[PDB]
Structures are given as C-alpha cells and as structure tokens.
C-alpha cells in the first residue's frame, strides 16, 4: 500500500496552508487505504496535543489514520484511540522504555500500535536505531529492538533511513511476520517502483505529494504495478 502523510503544526500543513481536511479527503478519494499524520505540536509539548483537530480529520475521512507525535504515556495512546485514530505511532518511547511499551501491546493490541524507528547504518554495517535525526545512535540495533517486541506480537514497524533498498530487503526477509513501512527517500515516482520488489508492505509518501511530483493515484498504480 501507499500511505500518504501530512505533518501538522498548530493546524498548518508543513507551509502548505492550514486546511488539511480537503487534502486528506482527496488522498482517500484517490484510493489510499490508510493515512499517516504527525502532530508536531504534540511532539513539542504533549499538553498542546491537537486532539480537537485530530478528531475532525479522522471523522472527515473513511480510512484508518495512524497518528504520531509526542506519544509518551499510556494516557497519550488512550486519548488518541478515543479520538478515533486507528493506530498510534510510537517513536522515542519505544526505544527508551521497551518494557513499558510491551505493556501497551498487551493492553491495546498489536493492531493498534506502529513502532517508528529511525535507522542509521554505521561504519560496521550495523543498522543503528536513533530516536531522531538530531541525536546520536542509542546503542541498539534495529534487529535487537524488533526482537524485543516480537514476543508481544509486534506487527507494524515504520523504518526511516536517516543515514536504502538493501536495508528493506534484509529486514523484511528476516522478519516476514512483520509488515514494514518505509519512510523518507521518495523524491519521485521511480523511488516507489524501486521499493516494489523488496518486501516492504507500505510506503509513506509526504513531501512528494505536497510538491506535486505525482498524485496518490499515480503512486498506487505504480506500486500495484
């Protein structure tokens, strides 16, 4: 599947205007089966989580939305789910407190959670996990972290290369019971084609859509070959 994405700061798409709803509705009209939203306001301060806006967006489309940004606590997860999101995207907390997040898998179910991992390939060829582009590696490999969560039924992993087709081939082959999503590196429609044979289950596309390089419809046609 193609997974269209939007980042939101105080109601604004990032500056591509402040009306995300018609955009999301048109993404769905073209055949998207899932949408990806990042709450940048919530990421900066979870007390200012854009819950009202998320409710409206979710209510206004007919497809599941996975939402991330400052999901730090069990209460954050619960609030998003209650607002009607389909899946909560867990990022830094998944790296920093795996035993706590394993508890979340137990409470909410693996269908409700996506682990978002930023990956750097280091000098020794190891896929290092990092909690953001701005920070050093955290000392755990992608494989070790995935294997940490497999015993609670991990199903969805969103992998961003912040340092690669080979990367996706390898991890997808190693964990065929996991549906991997790729993020980043989609600058044009040929990049979607390059991911087709890899085993990646979902391709997140954000900026390319906003810049009008191609449409969701064309992305899906390419992806489905």
Where are the domains positioned within the chain?
1-225
Annotated catalytic residue, options 19, 118, 161, 190: 118
Q: Is 191 a catalytic residue?
A: no
Annotated catalytic residue, options 7, 39, 76, 191: 7
Q: Experimental method used, please?
A: X-ray
The superfamily CATH assigns to domain 1-225 is Aldolase class I (3.20.20.70)
CB-count exposure of residue 19 (10 Å: 0-12, 13-18, 19+): exposed
The neighbour count for residue 26, using CB atoms within 10 Å, is 16
Distance, in Å, from the CA atom of 38 to the CA atom of 6, rounded to the nearest integer, reads: 6
Beta bridge partners of 120: 128
Distance, in Å, from the CA atom of 166 to the CA atom of 66, rounded to the nearest integer, reads: 26
SS3 120: strand
Counting other chains too, the contacts that 71-79 makes at CB distance below 8 Å and 24 or more residues apart are 71/42, 71/46, 72/46, 73/46, 74/100, 74/103, 74/104, 74/107, 76/46, 76/49, 77/104, 77/108, 77/112, 77/113, 79/49, 79/51
DSSP 8-state assignment for residue 183: E
- The residues near 26 (Cβ < 8 Å, ≥ 6 apart) are 216
Beta bridge partners of 87: 66
DSSP 8-state assignment for residue 111: G
Q: Is 15 a catalytic residue?
A: no
| Residue bearing tokens 């700061």 | 9
């Amino acid at each position: 599947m193609i997974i269209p994405a939007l980042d939101l700061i105080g109601g604004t798409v990032v500056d591509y205007g402040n009306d995300p709803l018609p955009r999301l509705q048109d993404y769905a009209a073209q055949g998207a089966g899932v949408l990806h939203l990042v709450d940048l306001t919530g990421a900066k301060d979870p007390a200012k989580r854009q819950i009202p806006l998320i409710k409206t967006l979710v209510a206004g489309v007919n497809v599941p939305v996975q939402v991330g940004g400052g999901v730090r606590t069990e209460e954050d997860v619960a609030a998003l789910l209650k607002a009607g999101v389909a899946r909560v995207v867990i990022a830094s907390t998944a790296v920093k407190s795996p035993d706590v997040v394993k508890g979340w898998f137990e409470r909410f179910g693996a269908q409700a959670l996506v682990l978002a991992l930023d990956v750097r390939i280091d000098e020794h060829g190891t896929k290092q996990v990092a909690v953001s582009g701005w920070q050093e590696n955290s000392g755990v490999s992608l494989e070790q972290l995935v294997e940490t969560y497999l015993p609670v039924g991990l199903k969805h992993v969103l992998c961003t290369d912040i340092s690669n087709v080979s990367l996706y081939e390898e991890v997808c082959a190693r964990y065929p019971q996991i549906a991997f999503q790729s993020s980043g590196g989609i600058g044009d429609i040929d990049d979607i084609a390059a991911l087709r044979g890899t085993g990646v289950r979902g391709v997140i596309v954000g900026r390319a859509l906003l810049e009008g390089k191609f449409t969701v419809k064309e992305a899906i046609q390419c992806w489905q070959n």
